[PDB]
Swiss-Prot record, chain D:
Gene name, Swiss-Prot/TrEMBL: MT-ND4
The entry's keywords: Electron transport, Membrane, Mitochondrion, Mitochondrion inner membrane, NAD, Respiratory chain, Translocase, Transmembrane, Transmembrane helix, Transport, Ubiquinone
One GO location term (cellular component): mitochondrial inner membrane
A Pfam family: Oxidored_q5_N
Disulfide bonds: none
Species of origin: Ovis aries (Sheep)
GO biological process: one example: electron transport coupled proton transport
Source organism superkingdom: Eukaryota
Subunit structure, as described in the record: Core subunit of respiratory chain NADH dehydrogenase (Complex I) which is composed of 45 different subunits.
Catalyses which reaction(s): a ubiquinone + NADH + 5 H(+)(in) = a ubiquinol + NAD(+) + 4 H(+)(out)
Entry function: Core subunit of the mitochondrial membrane respiratory chain NADH dehydrogenase (Complex I) which catalyzes electron transfer from NADH through the respiratory chain, using ubiquinone as an electron acceptor. Essential for the catalytic activity and assembly of complex I.
InterPro entries on file: NADH4_N, NADH_Q_OxRdtase_chainM/4, NADH_UbQ_OxRdtase, ND/Mrp_TM
Protein's UniProt name: NADH-ubiquinone oxidoreductase chain 4
Broad class of enzyme this protein falls into: translocase
Bilayer-spanning residue ranges: 22-42, 60-80, 98-118, 147-167, 196-216, 224-244, 256-276, 284-303, 308-330, 351-371, 391-411
């Protein structure tokens, strides 16, 4: 003797196929679906993906790397040529220091 | 546990133990001639007591047979390599594609296979063509207030196909 | 009378997507690879020369590859 | 980066005054233009950051995360149709403009100088996701999910503000550079421990740590797909980003009070990787997977090693990509079977013969297959933690075994072997779904070739 | 002939030898008949939901949805704090954590005091 | 992986291996010949028969179907059903 509602039995399986089996993924307008194919398969894969791959394939020396290679080569050549030990410790001057004495 | 009834019988249980014990002797007993010897020895053991009119004697000997069988079964019996448990067990389930599909194809691919698709369309027209009156009248006529069984009777009353048949007929061929 | 119709799910949508994907990686794959091949067959990278006596160059022309 | 900010403000009203059947192409095309524009920034050279008048700068702590967000936006957007397609054009414009505003505040959040501005943009990140998941969560407790979300993120994140005002009026202004240059250690008093506990606890709640991770799984099972991917990837990696920013100050006491947090995250990592083995509700497995990986991230952040920070940012970027993808495939499966439960949707080897290849590839990136960047992250974190305590490698490897186990079980359970022969409504997979797959994974492999970009500022 | 094959939590006791099957009464046969009738009626309703040409979607199982809602969010009620629940939660929650925390106290004390002394293999220990 | 089968050939094979058996006769032997009803042999020998069919044709028939065949026609029909051999 009671229902508590009024609404209709909804929805149905509105298949995106059974109308346009040539069509691509999204909704029922069969021109702008081809336009979406064009925009996401030219602007996601053609102009962005391989261009970004060639951009990251070579960009300048990120974090100064090849500069560091050649500078280390020249500095180790220096410290071979002058006979002093390469990479002396105490990077700061051992004289320029003030220890808090007792 | 079976679709026909609940109790098997005493005879059905004795018989299932007979088939299982004989299969285990097959698995124990290669070169097949000593198998024939021991199998007819087993047949002799069950014809020791054909004249059993008692019942509690029969079921107590059956329980002792289960004891003496579990005392001497074999761990890897020769199970047939297509049965469940065996070596196949839907081995070639790589291509058991269900047959509600082959209806969502592209229409050029449907232009590739014309006559088979015309025949499938007229089978499907036969399927929806004879659902309402026959199956509804049988499934409201023949059931009692409980259905109480699982094997179902055919459309023996007047005309066309027996009910509840689509996913029993149109199964894959088990060699795809 | 022996042969049987095998039942496949579909081929059209899958082969269509992979066809579009290979053609649209190939669409600007050929110009980029052929163009960079023209770059390293014509224009050259650079040489390893040194800063001369009293000269200050750009913040570019410190790099090997010309497109870099 | 105001050349990134002002096109986002010039992208939003276009969608408002876009006509019918034309909102989609306009938003997608212009967000891809924003993606190339984002790719222009990657320039960080050597010794310093790259600064810009007071508000803006860029590090490799921020640059791959920013590129991740702006690459994620069209992927987010194109996941976000066909489940509001029958709704109104005005409500559709409202949803899309809400996501654009959320992206805008995320770019604001990652390109922040002061931690005060970071706090403002932190809860600016908070606010739209609430409305999105609570309105479109599509289950009966999206209410509860949004409410737990907002109250945990506020109630954790709030005393962080008071500690930041205290650091403001004890050290002058709050540039990241001044805090590199005017910092001094604060010894083991009690108030130092409370200030560190407030800041790190706010971020702990954002991670989530194991003590307060009931926050997450309702907000993942009861969200639409755009907010799901935003929530998981960008909010958890934004929390880790904020911890990496603040932990440059207050070094000397984290050795004294980091021992409960490392322990809680390790044992919770083991318990969470165990709990995402045996549950139902297929969506939630990836939710607790994200919990387990962010617990590993937390251990990596607080044991304070350069190897650990490089592996931490690598694990952040890799898990953001993988979890966003795997959420999108879960939405594809829920489009198919209308279930969300695991054991119902079965088969999908006969049916859908190449969607399975993307499931396989996603689960192998989750498994730490060795060219996946997940493995680079996990490997550096394992090296650092074995340098940290020489016995905690057992918890790491047990996590490794269980991680491969539940991910491959999630693969073979639903998607290896037998259709239930009563589903009979799946169509072959759309080109849109496969487009989202090849937009997820092709940058993952092409980043896996030359991955020297994504490692941290301690390169 | 044998100690009659005890089961365990893992060792399955098969339906060959219970041995308590063999004392069948009439009420047990009535129980097996009612069980057969229940599975019969449920399969009949299943087949009639299952065999229409116009049905497109799923079979709409109520048992699986029942089990999922009873396992997911109908656990927190019901619940009461017993001695069993509280003790078992306190023994499985903070026990292993305080255990491995003690062993990390021990190993960190050993490492700190050890390299405080100087008897370690850190002639080169670079990747800090 | 291709042995083919027929109905008439496999029926001849089943009738062959029933004719091979000792304590029945080939005198009154045909396809419409019930086992327990009018050949007089026991159910025990009947399940030895079904055992022989399983041991030759290489697939287990279920224990529910070791009960209610009793005649060669339904045997040939059931084996042709399990092997799915028609044209």
């Amino acid at each position: 003797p009671t229902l508590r509602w009024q609404e209709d039995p909804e929805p149905e399986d509105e298949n995106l196929y059974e109308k346009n089996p040539d069509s691509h993924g999204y909704d029922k307008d069969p021109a702008v679906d081809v336009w979406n194919m064009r925009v996401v398969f030219f602007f996601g894969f053609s102009i962005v993906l391989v261009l970004g791959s060639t951009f990251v394939a070579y960009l300048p020396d990120y974090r100064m790397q090849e500069w560091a290679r050649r500078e280390a080569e020249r500095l180790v050549k220096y410290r071979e040529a002058h006979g002093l030990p390469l990479m002396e410790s105490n990077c700061f001057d051992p004289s320029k220091i003030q220890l808090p004495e007792d | 546990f079976l679709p026909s009834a609940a109790y098997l019988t005493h005879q059905q249980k004795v018989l299932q133990l007979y088939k299982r014990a004989l299969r285990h002797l097959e698995s124990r007993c290669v070169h097949r001639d000593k198998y024939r010897y021991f199998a007819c020895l087993l047949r002799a053991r069950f014809d020791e007591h054909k004249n059993e009119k008692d019942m509690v004697k029969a079921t107590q000997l059956l329980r002792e047979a289960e004891k003496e069988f579990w005392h001497g079964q074999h761990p890897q019996p020769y199970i047939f390599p297509e049965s469940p448990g065996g070596t196949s067990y839907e081995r070639y389930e790589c291509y058991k594609v269900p047959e509600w599909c082959l209806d969502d194809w592209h229409p050029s691919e449907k232009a590739m296979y014309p006559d088979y698709f015309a025949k499938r369309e007229q089978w499907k027209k036969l399927r929806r063509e004879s659902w309402e009156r026959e199956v509804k009248q049988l499934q409201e006529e023949t059931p009692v207030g409980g259905p109480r069984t699982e094997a179902l009777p055919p459309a023996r009353k007047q005309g066309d196909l027996p009910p509840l048949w689509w996913h029993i007929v149109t199964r894959p061929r088990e060699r795809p | 009378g022996k042969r049987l119709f095998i039942i496949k799910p579909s081929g059209f949508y899958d082969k269509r997507f992979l066809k579009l994907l290979r053609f649209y990686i190939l669409l600007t794959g050929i110009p980029v690879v052929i163009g960079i091949t023209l770059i390293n067959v014509f224009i050259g990278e650079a040489e390893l020369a040194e800063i001369p006596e009293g000269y200050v160059p750009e913040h570019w022309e410190y790099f090997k590859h010309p497109i870099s | 980066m105001l050349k990134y900010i002002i096109p986002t403000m010039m992208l939003m009203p276009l969608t408002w005054l876009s006509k019918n059947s034309m909102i989609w192409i306009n938003t997608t095309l212009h967000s891809l233009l924003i993606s190339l524009t984002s790719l222009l920034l990657l320039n960080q050279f050597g010794d310093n950051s790259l600064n810009f008048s007071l508000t803006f700068f860029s590090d490799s702590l921020s640059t791959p995360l920013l590129i991740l967000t702006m690459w994620l936006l069209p992927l987010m957007l194109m996941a976000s149709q066909h489940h509001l397609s029958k709704e109104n054009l005005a409500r559709k414009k409202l949803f899309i403009s809400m996501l654009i505003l959320l992206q805008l505040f995320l770019i604001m959040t990652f390109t922040a100088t002061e931690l005060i501005f970071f706090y403002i943009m932190f809860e600016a990140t908070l606010v739209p996701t609430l409305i999105i998941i609570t309105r479109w969560g599509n289950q009966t407790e999206r209410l509860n999910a949004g409410l737990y979300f907002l109250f945990y993120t506020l109630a954790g994140s709030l005393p962080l503000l008071v500690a930041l005002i205290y650091i403001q009026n004890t050290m002058g202004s709050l540039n990241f550079l001044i805090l590199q240059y005017w910092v001094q250690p604060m010894p083991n008093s009690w108030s130092n421990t409370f200030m560190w506990l407030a800041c790190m606890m706010a971020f702990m709640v954002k991670m989530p740590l194991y003590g307060l991770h009931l926050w997450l799984p309702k907000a993942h099972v009861e969200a639409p797909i755009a907010g799901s991917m935003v929530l998981a990837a960008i909010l958890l990696k934004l929390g880790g980003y904020g911890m990496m920013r603040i932990t440059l100050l207050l070094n000397p006491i984290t050795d004294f009070m980091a021992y409960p947090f490392i322990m809680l995250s390790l044992w919770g990592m083991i318990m969470t990787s165990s709990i995402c083995l045996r549950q139902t509700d297929l969506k939630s497995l990836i939710a607790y997977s994200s919990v387990s990986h962010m617990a590993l991230v937390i251990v990596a952040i607080l044991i304070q090693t350069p190897w650990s920070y490089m592996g931490a940012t690598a694990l952040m970027i890799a898990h953001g990509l993988t979890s966003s993808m795997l959420f999108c495939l879960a939405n594809s499966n829920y489009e198919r079977v209308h279930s969300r439960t695991m054991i119902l949707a079965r088969g999908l080897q006969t049916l859908l013969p190449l969607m399975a290849a993307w499931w396989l590839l996603a689960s192998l990136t989750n498994l730490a297959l060795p060219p996946s960047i997940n493995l680079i992250g996990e490997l550096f974190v394992v090296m650092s933690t074995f340098s940290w305590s020489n016995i905690t490698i057992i918890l790491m490897g047990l996590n490794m075994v269980i991680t491969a186990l539940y991910s491959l079980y999630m693969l073979i359970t639903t998607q290896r072997g037998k259709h239930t022969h009563h589903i009979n409504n799946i169509l072959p997979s759309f080109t849109r779904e496969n487009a989202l797959m090849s937009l997820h994974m092709l940058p993952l492999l092409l980043l896996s070739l030359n991955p020297k970009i994504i490692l941290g500022p301690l390169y | 002939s044998f100690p009659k094959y005890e089961p365990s939590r893992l060792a399955s006791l098969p339906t060959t030898l219970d041995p308590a099957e063999y004392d069948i009464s009439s009420e047990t046969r009535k129980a097996q008949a009612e069980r057969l009738a229940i599975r019969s009626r449920l399969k009949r309703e299943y087949q009639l939901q299952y065999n229409d040409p116009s049905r497109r979607g799923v079979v709409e199982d109520p048992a699986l949805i029942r089990w999922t809602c009873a396992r997911s969010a109908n656990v927190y009620p019901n619940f009461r704090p017993n001695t069993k629940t509280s003790l078992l939660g306190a023994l499985f929650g903070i026990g292993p954590l305080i255990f491995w925390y003690y062993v990390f106290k021990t190993d960190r004390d050993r490492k700190e005091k050890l390299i405080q002394e100087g008897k370690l293999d850190r002639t080169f220990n670079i990747s800090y | 992986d291709a042995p083919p089968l027929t109905l008439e050939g496999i029926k001849d094979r089943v009738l062959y291996v029933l004719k091979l058996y000792d304590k029945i006769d080939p005198e009154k032997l045909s396809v419409n010949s019930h086992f327990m009803k009018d050949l007089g042999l026991d159910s025990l020998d009947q399940v030895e028969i079904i055992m022989a069919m399983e041991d030759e044709f290489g697939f287990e028939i279920p224990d529910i179907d070791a009960e209610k065949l009793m005649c060669p026609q339904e045997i040939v029909d059931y084996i042709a059903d399990k092997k799915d051999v028609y044209e």
